[PDB]
């Protein structure tokens, strides 16, 4: 079922401004993502739907076509539950969505990315997990994210309070 | 397609609640079995596909 | 009477329009070996009599819906009323009619199978009656010979007679079908002979009975003898009486009433073929002009024409024990007696008295009737069914036993693999020894019953 | 079209405030199953596509 | 008909140990009508 529903959104259902006439897919998103959240069976192994997770991340991150904050919240919760349910199965499936956050750390839509990349280490803490080249880029990502905080556009208290990353797992 | 979609939506909305199933209520499982035999799972899986 | 009280014997009859004129069929089930139910035709009883042994059903309870629900929630002669839930118990096997959670029809139609259950526990063994066309009302009392519809409780489906690609099968679907419960019998008087009872026909003293030839005989077990001695305990001397009437075929026997005598072990009917004498014949060649017999005291009596058919239980006159009567044919009108053609020194038989039909018989041929136990009759019926099934299996095995398969695995009819497996399991459970934790007296009684059942099964074969 | 219009009304008598009423859903299910023609020419029975 | 209804009510309330207030109210309001019907039936016979 997840394999079949994975390929319905083609590049976030063509999030680029092309037609803006068929938004019923976004409507059915709020109906099927709830069922997807109702279960957490994709935990053990045999998970080649990393492209599906990337598609979901690009769908929540790109809301150019018929933006709706109400359904954006449902997609936000879907992504949060998906990340909090399973992890440490690969390395690219997390850094690639977080590449935008590492580069564009001042984006207003990066709060999902920061929240997920923060919730993952307290939930894991390297226990039953092996570091790799992905773990080697965490210092650079943390450094640039911190540098963007105080250099330009001094962040307000609301976002600065939520931008307190753990920055754990040193060496 | 609209008529079948509406009929399936009505049949799903008439399904017994989960706590009714988990707390006995043999009539609830009787209705659930009737709905189960009405339409198989493969039909739904193909419909979504 | 004629009110369908509790604890009477009934048969579920239905009408089918598949045939050009009409068809009457009665619901039936084998019991052991096959849990499913099937319809048995009855309108064609002029030449082929029906098997009424496995057709009778007994009404156990007739509680209301609320009382039934309370009883089910609390697990561990009331007049029948419309809207009540009833429990039906099979007469032959101590099994309860129920709607099984299975289906094989190639068309779902929300239809299940109608079968039998070993125990009354559960919800699928109860059927709620509903009125027919609006000549009655909910809560009104139910009369015999009145059409009605039966609704299952667990499946909420009618007892429907399907007209699918099959040939007149019975299932539990949402299509409406009308059934009526013809009352076979009712409250019967103690020690009186009624139609349908399996019994032994004793002659003269208590050491002679009307039996049939034993197994492994020179003939095809179609010669009627007058053997005595240890044969009185075996199942050979077990005969049953089938009145030509179909609705009230459980009433007290009447003098001169036409009846058919059937051997339960073999399934053959006593008849006169005018070719070999008084012999038992197959059910197909069992026309009423050759199979109908009767009992009457006062042998000659200047017999008159029988009349005055009774549409009820009737008065009881033929009493068990003291029933010294004479058997004669109705269509022809000749009596029967012991032949004894010659007292040969080397006859190699204790009596070996063949049964023959004569216009005027000898003296001392009056037969008095004694009934057999329920266990003996049930064992005889199981012996008959099991022997038939195993003979069919052996014939199916031997049809293909010669030519290798190569291609086209079905050479002929398919072997009843599932039926024979179920029959074997049922027989294994049947002969289970009693547990060792029972009390001494009851354990000894159960051991005696098991030994008697084993001896009865072995006498009619079932080992060869 | 008439089937869809009639099924629209029944969706409000069995599903209220996200929950489901047991009695109305049960009686609707029994009435629907007792008349198989309401399910359309596909979910009727023998010969159904 | 009223007797059948009362029997059904008793069958429904058999499982519970103590009948609540609402069941007792309906039982009383049915028994009052039963008493009235019984009185009407008696008046048909008295005065032989």
From Swiss-Prot, chain A:
Assembly information from the UniProt record: Homotetramer. Can also form heterotetramers with RYR2. Identified in a complex composed of RYR1, PDE4D, PKA, FKBP1A and protein phosphatase 1 (PP1). Repeated very high-level exercise decreases interaction with PDE4D and protein phosphatase 1 (PP1). Interacts with CALM; CALM with bound calcium inhibits the RYR1 channel activity. Interacts with S100A1. Interacts with FKBP1A; this stabilizes the closed conformation of the channel. Interacts with CACNA1S; interaction with CACNA1S is important for activation of the RYR1 channel. Interacts with CACNB1.
Family: Belongs to the ryanodine receptor (TC 1.A.3.1) family. RYR1 subfamily.
Residues of the full protein shown: 2520 to 2690 of 5037
Localisation per UniProt entry: Sarcoplasmic reticulum membrane
Domain of life: Eukaryota
Functional description taken from the UniProt entry: Cytosolic calcium-activated calcium channel that mediates the release of Ca(2+) from the sarcoplasmic reticulum into the cytosol and thereby plays a key role in triggering muscle contraction following depolarization of T-tubules. Repeated very high-level exercise increases the open probability of the channel and leads to Ca(2+) leaking into the cytoplasm. Can also mediate the release of Ca(2+) from intracellular stores in neurons, and may thereby promote prolonged Ca(2+) signaling in the brain. Required for normal embryonic development of muscle fibers and skeletal muscle.
Protein name (Swiss-Prot/TrEMBL): Ryanodine receptor 1
Organism listed in the record: Oryctolagus cuniculus (Rabbit)
Miscellaneous comment: Binding of [3H]ryanodine indicates that the heterozygous channel is activated by Ca(2+) concentrations 4-fold lower than normal. Single-cell analysis of cotransfected cells shows a significantly increased resting cytoplasmic Ca(2+) level and a significantly reduced luminal Ca(2+) level.
PTM notes: The N-terminus is blocked.
Gene name tied to this protein: RYR1
Domain notes: The calcium release channel activity resides in the C-terminal region while the remaining part of the protein constitutes the 'foot' structure spanning the junctional gap between the sarcoplasmic reticulum (SR) and the T-tubule. Pore opening is mediated via the cytoplasmic calcium-binding domains that mediate a small rotation of the channel-forming transmembrane regions that then leads to channel opening.
Origin organism lineage: Eukaryota, Metazoa, Chordata, Craniata, Vertebrata
């Amino acid at each position: 079922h997840v394999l079949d529903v994975g390929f319905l959104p083609d590049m976030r259902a063509a999030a680029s401004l092309d037609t803006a006439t068929f938004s019923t897919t976004e409507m059915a998103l709020a109906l099927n993502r709830y069922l997807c959240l109702a279960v957490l069976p994709l935990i053990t192994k045999c998970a080649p739907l990393f492209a599906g997770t990337e598609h979901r991340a690009i769908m929540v991150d790109s809301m150019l076509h018929t933006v709706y904050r109400l359904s954006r919240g449902r997609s936000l919760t879907k992504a949060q539950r998906d990340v909090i349910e399973d992890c440490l199965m690969a390395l690219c499936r997390y850094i690639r969505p977080s590449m935008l956050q590492h580069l564009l750390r001042r984006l207003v839509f990066d709060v999902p990315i920061l929240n997920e990349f923060a919730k993952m280490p307290l939930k894991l803490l390297t226990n039953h997990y092996e570091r790799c080249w992905k773990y080697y880029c965490l210092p650079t990502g943390w450094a640039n994210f911190g540098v963007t905080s105080e250099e330009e556009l001094h962040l307000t208290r609301k976002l600065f309070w939520g931008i307190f990353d753990s920055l754990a797992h040193k060496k | 397609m609209s008529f079948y979609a509406a009929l399936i939506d009505l049949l799903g909305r008439c399904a017994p609640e989960m706590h009714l199933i988990q707390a006995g209520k043999g009539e609830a499982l009787r209705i659930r079995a009737i709905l189960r035999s009405l339409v198989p799972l493969d039909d739904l899986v193909g419909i979504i596909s | 009477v004629q009110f369908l009280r509790t604890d009477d014997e009934v048969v579920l009859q239905c009408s089918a329009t598949v045939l050009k004129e009409q068809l009457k069929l009665c619901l039936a089930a084998e019991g052991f070996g096959n849990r499913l139910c099937f319809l048995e035709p009855t309108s064609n009883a002029q030449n082929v009599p029906p098997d009424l042994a496995i057709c009778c059903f007994t009404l156990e309870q007739s509680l209301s819906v609320r009382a039934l629900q309370e009883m089910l929630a609390n697990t561990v002669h009331r007049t029948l009323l419309y809207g009540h839930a009833i429990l039906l118990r099979h007469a032959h096997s101590r099994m309860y009619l129920s709607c099984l959670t299975t289906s094989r029809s190639m068309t779902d139609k929300l239809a299940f199978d109608v079968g039998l259950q070993e125990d009354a526990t559960g919800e699928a063994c109860w059927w709620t009656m509903h009125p027919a066309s609006k000549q009655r009302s909910e809560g009104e009392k139910v009369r015999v010979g009145d059409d009605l519809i039966l609704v299952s409780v667990s499946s909420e489906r009618y007892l429907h007679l399907s007209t699918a690609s099959g040939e007149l099968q019975v299932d539990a679907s949402f299509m409406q079908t009308l059934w009526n419960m013809n009352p076979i019998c009712s409250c019967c008087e103690e020690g009186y002979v009624t139609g349908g009872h399996v019994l032994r026909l004793f002659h003269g003293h208590m050491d002679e009975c009307l039996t049939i030839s034993a197994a492994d005989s020179d003939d095809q077990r179609r010669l009627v003898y007058y053997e005595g001695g240890a044969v009185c305990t075996h199942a050979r001397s077990l005969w049953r009486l089938e009145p030509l009437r179909i609705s009230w075929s459980g009433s007290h026997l009447r003098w001169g009433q036409p009846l058919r005598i059937r051997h339960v072990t073999t399934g053959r009917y006593l008849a006169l073929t005018e070719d070999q004498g008084l012999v038992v014949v197959d059910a197909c060649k069992a026309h009423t002009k050759a199979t109908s017999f009767c009992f009457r005291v006062s042998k000659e009596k200047l017999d008159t024409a029988p009349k005055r058919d009774v549409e009820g239980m009737g008065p009881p006159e033929i009493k068990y024990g003291e029933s010294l009567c004479f058997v004669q044919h109705v269509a022809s009108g000749l009596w029967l007696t012991y032949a004894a053609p010659d007292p040969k020194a080397l006859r190699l038989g204790v009596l070996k008295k063949k049964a023959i039909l004569h216009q005027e018989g000898h003296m001392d041929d009056a037969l008095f009737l004694t009934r057999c136990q329920q266990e003996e009759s049930q064992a005889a019926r199981m012996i008959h069914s099991t022997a038939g099934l195993y003979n069919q299996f052996i014939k199916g095995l031997d049809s293909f036993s010669g030519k290798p398969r190569g291609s086209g695995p079905p050479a002929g009819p398919a072997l009843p693999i599932e039926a024979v497996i179920l029959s074997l399991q049922d027989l294994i459970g049947y002969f289970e020894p009693p547990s060792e934790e029972l009390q001494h007296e009851e354990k000894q009684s159960k051991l005696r019953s098991l030994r008697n059942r084993q001896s009865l099964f072995q006498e009619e074969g079932m080992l060869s | 079209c008439g089937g869809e219009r009639y099924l629209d009304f029944l969706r409000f008598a069995v599903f209220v405030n996200g929950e489901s009423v047991e009695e109305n859903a049960n009686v609707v299910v029994r009435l629907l199953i007792r008349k198989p023609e309401c399910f359309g020419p596909a979910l009727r029975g023998e010969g159904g596509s | 008909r009223l007797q059948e209804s009362i029997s059904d009510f008793y069958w429904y309330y058999s499982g519970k140990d103590v009948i609540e207030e609402q069941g007792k109210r309906n039982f009383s309001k049915a028994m009052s009508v039963a008493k009235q019907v019984f009185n009407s039936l008696t008046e048909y016979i008295q005065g032989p």
